[PDB]
Each structure stands twice: as structure tokens, then as C-alpha cells.
Write a protein that holds these residues in place. Structure first.
Motif, PDB file in Angstrom:
ATOM      1  N   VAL A  43      -2.984  -1.310   3.028  1.00 39.12           N
ATOM      2  CA  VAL A  43      -3.920  -1.622   4.106  1.00 39.12           C
ATOM      3  C   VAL A  43      -4.342  -0.336   4.864  1.00 39.12           C
ATOM      4  O   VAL A  43      -5.450  -0.234   5.408  1.00 39.12           O
ATOM      5  N   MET A  44      -3.416   0.599   4.961  1.00 34.62           N
ATOM      6  CA  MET A  44      -3.589   1.785   5.778  1.00 34.62           C
ATOM      7  C   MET A  44      -2.913   2.984   5.158  1.00 34.62           C
ATOM      8  O   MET A  44      -2.257   3.779   5.838  1.00 34.62           O
ATOM      9  N   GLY A  45      -3.102   3.147   3.855  1.00 34.09           N
ATOM     10  CA  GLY A  45      -2.560   4.349   3.170  1.00 34.09           C
ATOM     11  C   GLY A  45      -3.325   5.593   3.613  1.00 34.09           C
ATOM     12  O   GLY A  45      -4.522   5.497   3.859  1.00 34.09           O
ATOM     13  N   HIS A  46      -2.627   6.726   3.798  1.00 26.43           N
ATOM     14  CA  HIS A  46      -3.269   8.027   4.094  1.00 26.43           C
ATOM     15  C   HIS A  46      -2.900   9.053   3.045  1.00 26.43           C
ATOM     16  O   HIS A  46      -1.708   9.109   2.590  1.00 26.43           O
ATOM     17  N   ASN A  47      -3.890   9.848   2.644  1.00 24.75           N
ATOM     18  CA  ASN A  47      -3.630  11.066   1.886  1.00 24.75           C
ATOM     19  C   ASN A  47      -4.391  12.149   2.606  1.00 24.75           C
ATOM     20  O   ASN A  47      -5.256  11.861   3.491  1.00 24.75           O
ATOM     21  N   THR A  84      -2.183  15.605  -1.102  1.00 25.72           N
ATOM     22  CA  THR A  84      -0.913  14.897  -1.089  1.00 25.72           C
ATOM     23  C   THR A  84      -1.001  13.600  -1.883  1.00 25.72           C
ATOM     24  O   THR A  84      -2.045  13.229  -2.418  1.00 25.72           O
ATOM     25  N   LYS A  85       0.118  12.875  -1.884  1.00 23.27           N
ATOM     26  CA  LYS A  85       0.149  11.528  -2.386  1.00 23.27           C
ATOM     27  C   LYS A  85      -0.428  10.687  -1.267  1.00 23.27           C
ATOM     28  O   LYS A  85      -0.531  11.131  -0.138  1.00 23.27           O
ATOM     29  N   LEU A  86      -0.760   9.458  -1.588  1.00 26.24           N
ATOM     30  CA  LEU A  86      -1.164   8.485  -0.598  1.00 26.24           C
ATOM     31  C   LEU A  86       0.101   7.879  -0.010  1.00 26.24           C
ATOM     32  O   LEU A  86       0.961   7.440  -0.761  1.00 26.24           O
ATOM     33  N   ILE A  87       0.242   7.879   1.310  1.00 27.88           N
ATOM     34  CA  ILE A  87       1.485   7.363   1.954  1.00 27.88           C
ATOM     35  C   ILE A  87       1.292   6.186   2.897  1.00 27.88           C
ATOM     36  O   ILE A  87       0.275   6.084   3.568  1.00 27.88           O
ATOM     37  N   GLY A  88       2.290   5.314   2.972  1.00 21.33           N
ATOM     38  CA  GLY A  88       2.273   4.207   3.944  1.00 21.33           C
ATOM     39  C   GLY A  88       3.040   4.546   5.218  1.00 21.33           C
ATOM     40  O   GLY A  88       3.451   5.696   5.439  1.00 21.33           O
ATOM     41  N   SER A  89       3.262   3.565   6.073  1.00 19.90           N
ATOM     42  CA  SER A  89       3.872   3.895   7.374  1.00 19.90           C
ATOM     43  C   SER A  89       5.319   4.306   7.175  1.00 19.90           C
ATOM     44  O   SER A  89       6.010   3.705   6.362  1.00 19.90           O
TER      45      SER A  89
END
Length: 128
Positions: A43-47, A84-89
Motif C-alpha cells: 500500500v505504501m512501499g518506498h524505494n 534501494t529495494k522497495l520497503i514497507g513500514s
């Protein structure tokens, strides 16, 4: 820090910086990305993805074509300088890259490729 920056992506689709200056003294540069918040990665992955300003849109569009299993990034995209990789909370990822891949005077953008998110999650990076 030096030759490094800690960046956070929060639950509101924002990075906590919009400008990175890379000291030209550095031989390498390290981005430490973290995700405070509760929201999960689907829902809110960040890279954190770096390209020239000119290349950012094609990277974003093709990252969307690649899809969530590809961390929203075209595999081996030659225009991606570093990612980077895509990360969750609650997760963390770091990327280090060679500063000799950048040059002074050129315009670079960092951004997240989660579909729709780069409208907000973006900034500039400069070598000086």
C-alpha cells in the motif's frame, strides 16, 4: 552524515528531504532509507531510485510496467544510477554507489517508483 544521507519515507507519501548534495570529496555515497509509519509495503512501499532529471519519467513509466514483483523497477534499466529495494513500514535498506557515476553541472532526481507516488516522493540530487 558524510558521504551519506539518511532518508525516511512516511505514511503520507513523502520523503523527509527534497534536496541532496553529494560532496565531491566522496568516492562513494550511501543512502540509508527507512519507513516509519505502520503502512505495509503493498500500500505504501518506498524505494529510493536515482537517475538524471531527463531520465526520471521513462524510469517511472517502465517501473510501472514491470510491476510489484519487480519492486516497480525495470530489471537492469540502464538509466538507473542506483536504487534501494522497495520497503514497507519498519524496514530499512541502503544503497551505496560510486560518485564517479555523477558529474557536476548535471541535474539528477531521486524518486520512489511505487505507482502514482513519485508525484509527491521526489527531489533533486547535485554533486558539488
Amino acid at each position: 552524515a558524510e558521504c551519506s544521507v539518511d532518508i525516511q519515507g512516511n505514511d503520507q507519501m513523502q520523503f523527509n528531504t527534497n534536496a541532496i548534495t553529494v560532496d565531491k570529496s566522496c568516492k562513494q555515497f550511501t543512502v540509508n532509507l527507512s519507513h516509519p509509519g505502520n503502512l505495509p509495503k503493498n500500500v505504501m512501499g518506498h524505494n529510493w531510485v536515482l537517475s538524471t532529471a531527463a531520465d526520471m519519467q521513462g524510469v517511472v513509466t517502465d517501473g510501472m510496467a514491470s510491476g510489484l514483483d519487480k519492486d516497480y523497477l525495470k530489471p537492469d534499466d540502464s538509466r538507473v544510477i542506483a536504487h534501494t529495494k522497495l520497503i514497507g513500514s519498519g524496514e530499512k535498506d541502503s544503497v551505496t554507489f560510486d560518485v564517479s557515476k555523477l558529474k557536476e553541472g548535471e541535474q539528477y532526481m531521486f524518486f520512489c517508483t511505487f505507482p502514482g507516488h513519485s508525484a509527491l516522493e521526489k527531489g533533486t540530487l547535485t554533486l558539488k
